[PDB]
Amino acid sequence: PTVHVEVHQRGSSTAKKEDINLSVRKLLNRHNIGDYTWTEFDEPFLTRNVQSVSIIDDLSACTVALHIFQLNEDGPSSENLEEETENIIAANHWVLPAAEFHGLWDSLVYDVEVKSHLLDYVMTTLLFSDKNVNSNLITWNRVVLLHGPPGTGKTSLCKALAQKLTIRLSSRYRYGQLIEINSHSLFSKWFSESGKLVTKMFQKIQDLIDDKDALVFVLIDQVESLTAARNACRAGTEPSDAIRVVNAVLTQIDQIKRHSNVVILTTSNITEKIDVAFVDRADIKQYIGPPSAAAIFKIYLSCLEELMKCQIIYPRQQLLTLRELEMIGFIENNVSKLSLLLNDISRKSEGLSGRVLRKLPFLAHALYVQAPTVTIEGFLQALSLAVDKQFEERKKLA
Amino acid sequence: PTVHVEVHQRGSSTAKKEDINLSVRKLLNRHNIGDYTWTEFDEPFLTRNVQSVSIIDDLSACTVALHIFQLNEDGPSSENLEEETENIIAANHWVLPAAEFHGLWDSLVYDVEVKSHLLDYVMTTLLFSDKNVNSNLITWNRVVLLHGPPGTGKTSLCKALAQKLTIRLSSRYRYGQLIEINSHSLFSKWFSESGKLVTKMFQKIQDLIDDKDALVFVLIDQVESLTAARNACRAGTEPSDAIRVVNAVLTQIDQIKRHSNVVILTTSNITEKIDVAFVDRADIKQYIGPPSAAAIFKIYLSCLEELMKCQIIYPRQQLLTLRELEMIGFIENNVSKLSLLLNDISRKSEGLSGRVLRKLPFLAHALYVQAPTVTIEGFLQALSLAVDKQFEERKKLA
Amino acid sequence: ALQLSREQGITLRGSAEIVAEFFSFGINSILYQRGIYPSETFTRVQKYGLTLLVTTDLELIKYLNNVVEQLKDWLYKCSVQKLVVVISNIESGEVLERWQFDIECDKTAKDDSAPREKSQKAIQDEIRSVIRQITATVTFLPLLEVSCSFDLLIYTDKDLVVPEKWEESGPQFITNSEEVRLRSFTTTIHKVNSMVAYKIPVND
Amino acid sequence: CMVPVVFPGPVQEGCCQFTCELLKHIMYQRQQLPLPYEQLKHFYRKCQQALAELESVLSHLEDFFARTLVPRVLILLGGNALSPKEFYELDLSLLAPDQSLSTAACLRRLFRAIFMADAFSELQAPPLMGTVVMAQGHRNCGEDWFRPKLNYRVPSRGHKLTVTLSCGRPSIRTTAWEDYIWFQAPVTFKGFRE
């Protein structure tokens, strides 16, 4: 009965772990009765010290493992290039849980638990890892290769994964770090120095690696920038540069293998020219596709909810995930027809990108709402016309 | 009932705003009535302090919201882009509203009635971003990608757009900026330069972003230059560099999507070598082929009003508009016959580029008149001659 | 796709050369601006990636060329340590202006055969700093109500290596003179501090 | 860094040539012109035309100061009117239209200060760039050659140096300035070099 639990610790509070532990357990045990978002408090302690306590995948007697995270505040931690070229953004160094990415885990929807797969990846990782398994016999690479066509959330998923792993591993990591590998930065003008300082970068990595209190999160967006090609024409024109620095990056992955705390996140909207080196160092190798119908549905629901919370649609209303829609047998009544036409919106919406999707509601509120206030029953067909436009647009896009 | 107003303060005025507000609203009190450009006045106050009073989408018992805008003069384009302090590089820097485009939005007509739509996009931007919506639930990447056959107003359109925009949105924006990248900038003889180049580009653009007061317009002209073949099947060296560009470009845009005050206007040719990513973050696609007969007639009317006003064709005449032409339904008289001849012209003018279109009368008078004095509608037969010329010109060259 | 740093290095004698022409052009410009000599009679050249005042006084031309090479020598032996240009009245000859340049050399240049990391870029721009600075300094030097002449003082610690025509002389202080310091500049071998002394005004 | 200037005596037309020689001094100390304009009297295409640009600037400056007072003068290098590559502020707020001292005395005192204000300490020889001068003026002075910028603001980056004054006067108001408004040089100066 594993039930992981979130505890948002303020950067403005003063409470500590035991106080908050007792307090939150008292809150639950007071209620102790799907998933809920405990945000309206009765106890003054957490009212002053905690901003959000929710759980995301009806009963009580499950292993309620609380987990306390303090969403920090700093966004950038400038670590410029060691060599030269002042004010060149070498490292974007992201403190752990800091609120940039709060609640962003609710982005994706791929109900095959692809998320959960990637999630408990690192959990099982550390389980095997620090329980005396022989590397020499069984070993992996703490690369993680998300994989899928663009407009899907790959980099976003990387980030959210890091955040959630954070909230989980408080028991074993008081904190950790994310590392925005500015790939295009990594190279150098010169003949050699490029690889030479690839080392330096991975050394800044090793810095964090030493911190057993922390947990390392390499984030190499668009690794092809690192690894151009072993398969081009002989005119590569920077071969002794390109391929060289590439296999250097290979060496660095291969050294960082042996540790037990690092994880490398890697994606490509552009898998075409991926260089066999990574794919053969063969992380989870998680393929992704565009969102599913039900996915579009859930995401539209979330959109509507954020909207009604910011009053942009004034008469706040009720929604129904496909669960209750399917239980009511899709009976055509006034209440249902809202979400039923919504489902139709989705069923014609599939074939598009979640990026464009979460673009839709707002940009439609611009396009066909044409009013500072609007309600559902026209907002919906409005979104419909918007999506029709989107398809005809990609068509005309030639 | 919101009727905005194009309150032009001539830079020569030097008087302060509120007085002008008062006087213009009193002008309104006077006339109390289609959309027009009031210049000739009664009170000498406005007569001196104003150079034009225009309004676009009669009636005045509505909510009039004035917009006092003062023009500016110099587009210096001074932008170092000093990779090594030795670079004179292609970054235009236009202080917003200025004589560059005063009166341009007045003319760039479009079949789809794109304008209203694209326009109130950025209007929706504020009024329903600054509701403090959780961005990380509903995003709008600020990256608009028009497109169409070359020479179709596109770059002109985006320019005049931002012009009128910064006009409409004074209260919350002391002013704005236009940064015009010119990819010819961006390339380099050397592998590994271009990335640093782009990063530093948006470094300075980030600078201009930093002020919350200003308003940022990134006027990319030929995005395709950047994103030629990120995902495509030719030789790899030029592709090594090209990838190594576009990757960083994309990452930087995904950064800068974190400020409520930036708009990336983007544009391209047939360009079907476009992309797979700006295709993605194309929050507002827009296909713009050649115009239709209607817009053609409107543009020609504008042309004829120019040629009357500057008295380059001396005997002034009377015209109509398609609406006006339809109130009497194209029925023939020797009064509107001339506009009807223009109509025949348009009916055979379409299939061209508006660029060439507004260039036509210029060319016709240079090539078939040779009389600085010339009667219009003698003008038009030779105009049609030059039209047919243009046709066979394309026919030959293609 | 590559480039390469090719750093040349520096020498005792190269430092001497460059700092010698430094003082050449600097003295030229100083004696140009304040009015010490006929300004009209001079012209400009391109040096240090900038524009420089150059004389035509064949007399002073040859004279200062002699001084330049002799200083090149004494730098190549670290011999001199002060370089001053004392400007005075014509007849009463009272000192009005005294540009003191205090010199540091590298004794270890005997063994310092291997070069030192410092660029023509760096040295050049730093002398440009010097030049532009001295130029600026005219903006406050109390103007010469008369015409003037000048004499050239140095201080080589050695009374030993003295060539023929040079004679020993006196310190030539000023009674009421303010001294104001200019930016420093060096070669990692030779540094030269700089400061002008000038007769304190009689009236404010 | 920040540097004011200390004067015992007040002024009126001093301000004019103050700004004049300061501007000049600066445009030299940023390499924009091969030699100080005071000595550019030699050599009589870009050279003379840019110098005449500068002269028109100077002349209309004198015009403007003759017309009304100025609290603050701005001089830009690159960027735009609303953002510089770098800039210099020249305070005149502390002055009213008295003095028997010589204007040249204030000039040399202030410039000796500037030197002791240690400014222009950048080995990094900047390239050849663009220059615009601005300053505030009377709300209704009917100024013609300049042009106001009713939406202008002092940018807050690349603060090379605000040169500030003090003439030893006790305490003045601020409303005497709140009516005034920035104007702008109608034509960007460009600094050449060979």
Ligand SMILES: Nc1ncnc2c1ncn2[C@@H]1O[C@H](COP(=O)(O)OP(=O)(O)OP(O)(O)=S)[C@@H](O)[C@H]1O
């Ligand atoms: N299925 C989805 N669910 C939720 N958000 C999505 C989805 N698809 C796209 N998005 C949004 O689109 C953006 C994706 O961010 P990223 O992590 O950079 O995407 P990605 O994985 O990098 O794909 P690319 O390469 O950037 S197009 C975020 O704003 C997400 O919220």
Ligand SMILES: Nc1ncnc2c1ncn2[C@@H]1O[C@H](COP(=O)(O)OP(=O)(O)OP(O)(O)=S)[C@@H](O)[C@H]1O
């Ligand atoms: N519908 C139109 N209405 C008015 N002027 C137009 C129209 N279409 C084109 N033009 C003119 O054609 C020119 C187009 O300028 P741009 O903004 O560069 O055009 P474009 O859409 O960018 O195509 P290119 O290939 O970039 S020039 C301007 O002089 C416009 O005035």
